């Protein structure tokens, strides 16, 4: 009755401001459980995530923080809104558990990927997804983990991006922890330790839009390394220009693989899988396929960007300057790309964050 409480959430325990009722799970992941709840005070339902071991490693810290920060510093109608963030512990001593609260849609894109849409829906859905990202990119922010699990739709046919716990900027490194993004969607620059640009997201975007048409994961991959082989078997071995960019160690292996020419996108994606072409030009299989072939490209330097995705004949017939080129968000300057701290030191910033964010 200390104005909080706990609920036996499946495997573990939760602790939230009484206002949140009927906590049933929906999100079981690599960042902790996330259950739906009915915020009374709000008169609308919400979702609550409980960060799993936020201080376990000097890295989780770096992610929990960015998570928070970025959830706060960035807004769009296509980015899950941060309703709140709280902690039950009273002081930094106690402090170690953080619950984040945000609006909740109706389902997962995995739910969509299991139904056949039409150019209207599919194109619109991609459009929204594309606007959501453009927002992040406009601030030099990369998501590094776009996938179905991180995209939600609601009955009114609108979608919103999710999770930022892995979201960051820059690209110095080759990703010391590339093992983190979800295999089936890793972009070539990630797989082959390379240093990514913003366009490293449009790859995942292709892997997804391809999943909505095919209805199966685009590039399977029984393991971190098999992933690559699944990519080339589809799109064919990259050219020598590309190879010349890999670390000496990676370049050699990448060159000792069998050579695949790949298959045409008309083959990878025959018409029949795409919605029914009407008679209208902009929303045709030809176009949807064309956009695909410009995202599913190994060489990042030759791969489309959001700017152009939003301008493409298939996604462009919804284009709206506001949504498209909204105002670039603005993080203070805490967010960076390297800045390392202690387990405690990090914990320090989190608290003084969870606080003025309560």
């Amino acid at each position: 009755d200390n104005n909080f409480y706990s609920v036996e959430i499946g495997d573990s325990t939760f602790t939230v401001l009484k206002r949140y009722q009927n906590l049933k799970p929906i999100g079981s992941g690599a960042q902790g459980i996330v259950c739906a709840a009915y915020d009374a005070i709000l008169e609308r339902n919400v979702a609550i995530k409980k960060l799993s071991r936020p201080f376990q490693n000097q890295t989780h810290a770096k992610r929990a923080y960015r998570e928070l920060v970025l959830m706060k510093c960035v807004n769009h109608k296509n980015i899950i809104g941060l309703l709140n963030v709280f902690t039950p512990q009273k002081s930094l001593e106690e402090f170690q558990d953080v619950y984040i609260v945000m609006e909740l849609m109706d389902a997962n894109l995995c739910q969509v990927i299991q139904m056949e849409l039409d150019h209207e829906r599919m194109s619109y859905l991609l459009y929204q997804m594309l606007c959501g990202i453009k927002h992040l990119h406009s601030a030099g922010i990369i998501h590094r983990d776009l996938k179905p699990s991180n995209i939600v739709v609601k009955s009114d046919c609108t979608l919103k991006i999710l999770d930022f716990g892995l979201a960051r900027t820059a690209g110095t490194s080759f990703m010391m922890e590339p093992e983190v993004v979800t295999r089936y969607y890793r972009a070539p620059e990630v797989i082959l330790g390379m240093g990514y640009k913003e366009n490293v997201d449009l790859w995942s975007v292709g892997c997804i839009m391809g999943e909505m048409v095919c209805h199966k994961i685009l590039f399977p991959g029984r393991d971190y390394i098999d992933q690559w082989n699944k990519v080339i078997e589809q799109l064919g071995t990259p050219c020598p220009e590309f190879m010349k960019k890999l670390q000496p160690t990676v370049r050699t292996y990448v060159e000792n693989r069998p050579k695949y020419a790949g298959y045409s996108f008309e083959k990878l994606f025959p018409d029949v899988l795409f919605p029914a072409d009407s008679e209208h030009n902009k929303l045709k299989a030809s176009q949807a396929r064309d956009l695909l072939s410009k995202m599913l490209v190994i060489d990042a330097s030759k791969r489309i960007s959001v700017d152009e995705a939003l301008q493409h004949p298939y996604i462009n017939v919804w284009y709206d300057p506001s949504e498209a080129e909204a105002p670039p968000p603005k993080i203070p300057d805490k967010q960076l790309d390297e800045r390392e701290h202690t387990i405690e030191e990090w914990k320090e910033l989190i608290y003084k964050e969870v606080m003025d964010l309560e």
Binding site: M115, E120, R121, S155, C157, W318
Partner: peptide, 10 residues
Amino acid sequence: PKRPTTLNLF
């Protein structure tokens, strides 16, 4: 060409 408003998530 107007934006959809429904989506049978069932």
